[PDB]
């Protein structure tokens, strides 16, 4: 039932390595049985029911069963489970390529769209047909046989290269050893949490909860330098080899399909449409940010020169890679009176979660309830049920996986586990999502205390979760967050705006010790500090966007050299010689290839919606909130991103709000 | 899956 929850979450998280392998073979056999049956149909015998409906039914059945197999590699604490899950992902990704390139299927869906009366089927079904045919041409199914075979074998090679690229980074266990003196300025609650060695030193890993505090707060330059070198040389050997194969393969496939570059090939499926639009966007934004970057670099150099003189260090007259975050942190403290280590005392994780849940309850008309004795993949994971406040309809469930551990995905991500689409029997499947982050653990007898940047990350990822939960479509391939890549960051970045509002922040904060609120003056300073370091922080994202475009545009380019080029020309902070940042650039292998610009691209849309609608009429207005759910989240991928933006804004978007929020124009 | 900025 749409108003119940029992039995609607069919996910199991107690699979052994052997069961993962057995289930993978069973899923492939049963799924191939459906594609074979459709392929055996006479071309003049195909109908909506025996062809379109049959393929739609197997897509939802397959994607849900696939989740139980390919998700544990990201979260399971058992390394053998993670390894079996990775092997299942490799095998199922090759199987996905085989089925996607069946000419008999492509021939029959093409014949269905040409013969059936499109006017008498739902618009999302017409979208299913045209997108399916478009995907077929993007797989070369309209091309001769031997070029299809060449594309297939290359796509199979690329799927394993991408999986290995991220597997290497996920299982890396690099660590460094530092003495207490070498960890100067770092607080005791951080130091007293590290493992000690036989020489009374401390082991520090390259995980974010270790790397970031060292780079932001450690006053020993050599300590920051050794960490930056290790962080930007993770998997240097093996992942450079992967890039040296993956990037030419992407180019050669795009050429066979008729595109000049891989960047052109992927841009066609995004709202930006073309690479020349991306270049003009990044290049014009870079020029507007140039004066801010110069002023910020000047101030940082003055900070470093004074500290070197005070601490008696050598001064090299430049901003090294291992200096940037450290002096950006000082800029925040000095110019805006923001001490992140003091401010986190007001963000205990339970208060932040409570206020985050209450924000969506009041704004989007939803109800949240934590499930007790939930079936989860790790003891620290919690499960929540989402209902529509007015009707009681059970929209979905989401898991919260908030703390780091061995073998867990290091970054911050949202995972779609069940699509909120229609089932073969006509009923609606309950959507399921998982929020996976690595927040500071409880230490020193205190609850987990989140820095404001961790609260913003929490809100960012929860925006993805609610997009997955609120989206309801007929077909699984349009469900949840299956929108354009340069559009999927709109709901995530939209929610971040609620951590930069005074009244909202007052509701999210409560001192862990005496329950007192953040002082009014400090709240005003926190909100006004939103643009601190924005020049170099944004220019760094432009560097990443430019490197991503270039590595998928020019063919015979050294990725490390191309990164170093844009670091000097755009950011003004040289890349450390000997490092290879692109070899750690997981986005290049995680579906963001040629599309990393999408973060900045999405921010223009989210800022326009927040300023023009929410801020103009109250950012807690439930009427504007419900309009946002129905027009932006609920359609999922069943509508074009620009169409949903136009429905919400009632006009075309522009950069006025985006530029105004950056202190530009 | 969906990722945050690097
Ligand atoms: Cl069910
Ligand atoms: Na010191
Ligand atoms: Na509006
Ligand atoms: Zn734009
Ligand atoms: Zn994201």
C-beta atoms of A461 and B4 within 8 A: yes
The number of C-alpha atoms within 13 Å of B1 and in the hemisphere containing its C-beta is 25
What are A241's two structure tokens? 């080899």
Q: Does A414 touch chain B (CB under 8 A)?
A: yes
- Domains present along chain A, CATH in parentheses: 1-100+102-138 (1.20.1050.40), 173-233 (no CATH), 268-340+535-589 (no CATH), 345-532 (3.40.390.10)
d(CA A311, CA A595): 44
Classify A274 as helix, strand or coil. Answer: coil
Tell me whether A412 touches chain B (CB under 8 Å). Answer: yes
List CB contacts of A33: < 8 A, sequence separation 6 or more: none
Q: Which contacts of A112-117 are long-range, i.e. CB under 8 A and separated by 24 or more positions?
A: A112/A46, A112/A47, A112/A48, A112/A51, A112/A52, A116/A47, A116/A48
The token pair at A200 is 């009374």
Assess contact for A509 and A312: CB atoms under 8 A: no
Determined by which method? X-ray
- The tokens describing A639, both together, are 């509508």
Coil vs helix vs strand at A83: helix
Q: How far away, in angstroms, is A284 Cα from ligand 1 center?
A: 50
Backbone torsions φ then ψ of A448, nearest 5 degrees? -55, 125
Closest residue by Cα to residue A464 from A495, A498, A439: A495
Tokens of A94: 């090759």
* Nearest of A132, A145, A138, A144 to residue A106 by alpha carbon: A132
Distance CA A343, CA A279 (A): 39
Chain A residues near residue B5 by CB distance under 8 angstroms: 541, 599
SS (H, E, C) A604-657: HHHHHHHHHHHHCCCCCCHHHHHHHHHHHHCCCCCCCHHHHHHHHHCCCCCCHH
User: Any idea what the Cα angle at residue A373 is, between residues A367 and A375, rounded to 5°?
Assistant: 90
CA separation for the pair A185, A139 (Å, rounded): 55
CA quadruple A157, A162, A167, A170: dihedral, nearest 10: 170
Enter the tokens of residue A81.
């489970």
Pairing of strands B2-3, A431-436: unpaired
Question: CA–CA separation, A624 vs A86, rounded Å?
Answer: 43
Q: What's the CA angle centered on A66, arms A62 and A67, to 5 degrees?
A: 125
Q: What does each C-alpha distance from B5 to A52, A134, A280, A460, A553 come to in angstroms?
A: 37, 29, 21, 10, 21
Specify the 3-state DSSP secondary structure of A383: strand
CB pairs under 8 A between A and B: 34
Check CB contact under 8 Å for A411 and B1.
no
CB A246, CB A338: distance < 8 Å: no
What end-to-end distance do the CA atoms of chain A give, in Å?
52
**Beta strands at A394-401 and A431-436: parallel, antiparallel or unpaired:** parallel
The count of other CB atoms within 10 Å of the CB of residue A634 is: 19
Q: Which of A59, A124, A296, A461 is catalytic?
A: A461
Task: Give the single-character DSSP code of A229.
Answer: H
**Do the beta carbons of residue A602 and residue A489 sit within 8 Å?**
yes
Residue A576 region, left (φ>0) first, then alpha (ψ -120 to 50), else beta? beta
Tokens representing residue A434 in the block: 């998982």
Please, what is the Cα angle at A278 between A276 and A279, to 5 degrees?
65
A543–chain B Cβ distance below 8 A for any pair = no
Q: How far is A38 from A106, CA to CA, in rounded Å? A: 10
Asked if residue A421 lies in contact with residue A60, where contact means CB atoms within 8 angstroms, the answer is yes
Nearest-angstrom CA–CA distance, A364 and A488: 19
Structure tokens at A576: 């450390």
Q: What letter does residue A449 receive in the DSSP assignment?
A: B
Which of A184, A181, A137, A209 has its CA nearest to residue A439?
A: A209
DSSP strand E in A26-78: where? none
> Which residue do the tokens 């291992």 mark?
A322
The alpha helices in A426-533, defined as continuous H runs, are 452-470, 489-496, 502-508, 520-528
Nearest to A386 by CA among A397, A373, A376, A377: A397
| Contact (CB, 8 A) for A588 and A597 | no
Using a CB-CB cut-off of 8 Å, the residues of chain B touching A416 are 1
Assign A21 to helix, strand or coil.
helix
How far from the centroid of its chain's Cα atoms is residue A571's Cα?
A: 23
- For residue A600, give both structure tokens: 């900045």
CB contact set of A28 (below 8 Å; sequence gap of 6+): A91, A92, A95
CA distance A64 to A535: 43
Give every CB contact of residue A582 below 8 A, 6+ residues apart in sequence: A243, A547, A551, A559, A560, A562, A563, A588
Q: Which residues pair with A383 in a beta bridge?
A: A399
- DSSP 3-state of A230: helix
**Tokens 């690329």 sit on residue:** A158
What is the C-alpha radius of gyration for chain B, rounded to an integer number of angstroms?
A: 5
Neighbours of A315 (CB within 10 A): 12
Q: Which residue has the tokens 């039914």?
A: A57
CA dist A379 and A382 (Å) reads 8
Give A333: exposed, middle or buried? Use CB within 10 Å, 0-12, 13-18, 19+.
middle
Q: Is A210 annotated as a binding residue?
A: no
Name residues whose C-beta falls within 8 Å of residue A432's C-beta, 6 or more positions apart in sequence.
A9, A11, A396, A397, A398, A399, A416, A417, A418, A468
Residue A560 per-residue DSSP state: H
A76, A194, A139: which is closest to A444 by C-alpha?
A194
| Residue found under tokens 């004074």 | A306
Bridge partners, A388 (sequence order): A366
Contacts of A218 (CB under 8 A, 6+ apart): A183, A184, A185, A186, A224, A227, A326
Under a CB-based contact definition with an 8 Å cutoff, are residues A331 and A303 in contact?
A: yes
Q: Is the dihedral of CA A146, A87, A210, A450 positive or negative?
A: positive
Residue A150 among the catalytic residues: no
Chain B interface mutation, best of A399, A489, A597, highest count of B Cβ atoms under 10 Å: A489
How far apart (Å, rounded) are the C-alpha atoms in residues A394 and A429?
Answer: 10
Pair of tokens at residue A406: 């061995």
Task: Tell me if A620 sits within 8 A of A363, measured CB to CB.
Answer: yes
The whole-angstrom separation of Cα A642 and Cα A645 is 5
In b/e form, how buried is each residue of A230-252, taking b as 16+ CB within 10 angstroms?
A: bbbbbbbeebeebbeebbeebbe
User: In this structure, how many other beta carbons lie within 10 angstroms of the beta carbon of residue A23?
Assistant: 18
Output phi, psi for A74, to 5 deg. Answer: -95, -15
Task: Compute how many other C-beta atoms are within 10 angstroms of the C-beta atom of residue A40.
Answer: 9
């Amino acid at each position: 039932s749409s108003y119940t929850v029992a039995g609607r979450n069919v996910l199991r998280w107690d699979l052994s390595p052997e069961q993962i392998k057995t289930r993978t073979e069973e899923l492939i056999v049963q799924t191939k049985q459906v594609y074979d049956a459709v392929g055996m149909l006479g071309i003049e015998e195909v109908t909506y029911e025996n062809c379109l409906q049959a393929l739609a039914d197997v897509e939802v059945k397959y994607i849900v069963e696939r989740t139980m197999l390919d998700f544990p590699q990201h979260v399971s604490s058992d390394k053998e489970v993670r390894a079996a899950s990775t092997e299942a992902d490799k095998r199922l990704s090759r199987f996905d390529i085989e089925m996607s390139m069946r000419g008999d299927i492509f021939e029959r869906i093409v014949h269905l769209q040409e013969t059936c009366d499109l006017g008498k089927i739902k618009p999302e079904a017409r979208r299913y047909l045209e997108k399916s045919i478009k995907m077929g041409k993007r797989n070369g199914l309209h091309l001769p046989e031997q070029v299809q075979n060449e594309i297939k074998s290359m796509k199979k090679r690329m799927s394993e290269l991408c999986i290995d690229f991220n597997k290497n980074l996920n299982e890396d266990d690099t660590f460094l050893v530092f003495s207490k003196a070498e960890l100067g300025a770092l607080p005791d609650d951080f130091i007293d949490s590290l493992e000690k060695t036989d020489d009374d030193k401390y082991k520090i890993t390259l995980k974010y909860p270790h790397y970031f505090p060292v780079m932001k707060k450690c006053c020993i330059p050599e300590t920051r330098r050794r960490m930056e070198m290790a962080f930007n040389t993770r998997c240097k050997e093996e992942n450079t080899i992967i890039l040296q194969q993956l990037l030419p393969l992407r180019t050669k496939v795009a050429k066979l399909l008729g595109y000049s570059t891989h960047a052109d090939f992927v841009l066609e499926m995004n709202t930006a449409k073309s690479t020349s639009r991306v270049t003009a966007f990044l290049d014009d934004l870079s020029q507007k940010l140039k004066p801010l970057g110069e002023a910020e670099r000047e101030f940082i150099l003055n900070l470093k020169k004074k500290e070197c003189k005070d601490r008696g260090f050598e001064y090299d007259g430049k901003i090294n890679a291992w200096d940037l975050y450290y002096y950006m942190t000082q800029t925040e403290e000095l110019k805006y009176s923001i001490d992140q280590e003091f401010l986190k005392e007001y963000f205990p994780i339970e208060v932040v979660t409570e206020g985050l849940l209450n924000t969506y309850q009041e704004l989007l008309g939803l109800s949240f309830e934590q499930m007790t004795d939930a079936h989860v993949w790790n003891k620290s994971v919690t499960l929540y049920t989402v209902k529509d406040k007015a009707t009681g309809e059970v929209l979905g469930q989401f898991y919260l996986d908030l703390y780091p551990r061995e073998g867990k995905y290091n970054h911050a991500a949202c995972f779609g586990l069940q699509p909120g689409c229609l089932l073969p029997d006509g009923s609606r499947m309950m959507a399921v999502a998982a929020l996976v982050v690595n927040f500071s653990q409880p230490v020193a007898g205190r609850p987990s205390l989140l820095r404001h940047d961790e609260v913003r990350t929490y809100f960012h990822e929860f925006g993805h979760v609610m997009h997955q939960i609120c989206a309801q479509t007929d077909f699984a391939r349009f469900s949840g967050t299956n929108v354009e890549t340069d559009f999927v960051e709109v709901p995530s970045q939209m929610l971040e705006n609620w951590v930069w509002d005074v009244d909202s922040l007052r509701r999210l904060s409560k001192h862990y010790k005496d329950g007192s609120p953040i002082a009014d003056d400090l709240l005003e300073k926190l909100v006004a500090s939103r643009l601190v370091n924005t020049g170099l922080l944004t220019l760094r994202q432009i560097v990443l966007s430019k490197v991503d475009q270039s590595l998928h545009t020019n063919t015979s380019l050294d990725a490390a050299s191309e990164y170093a080029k844009y670091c000097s020309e755009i950011l003004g902070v040289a890349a450390t010689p000997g490092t290879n940042m692109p070899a750690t650039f997981g986005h290049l292998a995680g579906g963001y290839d040629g599309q990393y610009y999408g973060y900045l691209w999405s921010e223009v849309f989210s800022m326009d919606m927040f300023y023009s609608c929410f801020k103009k009429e109250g950012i807690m207005n439930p009427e504007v909130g419900m309009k946002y759910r129905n027009l932006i989240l609920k359609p999922g991928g069943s509508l074009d991103g620009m169409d949903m933006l136009h429905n919400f804004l009632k006009r075309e978007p522009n950069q006025k709000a985006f530029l105004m929020s950056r202190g530009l124009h | 899956f969906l990722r945050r900025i690097r």
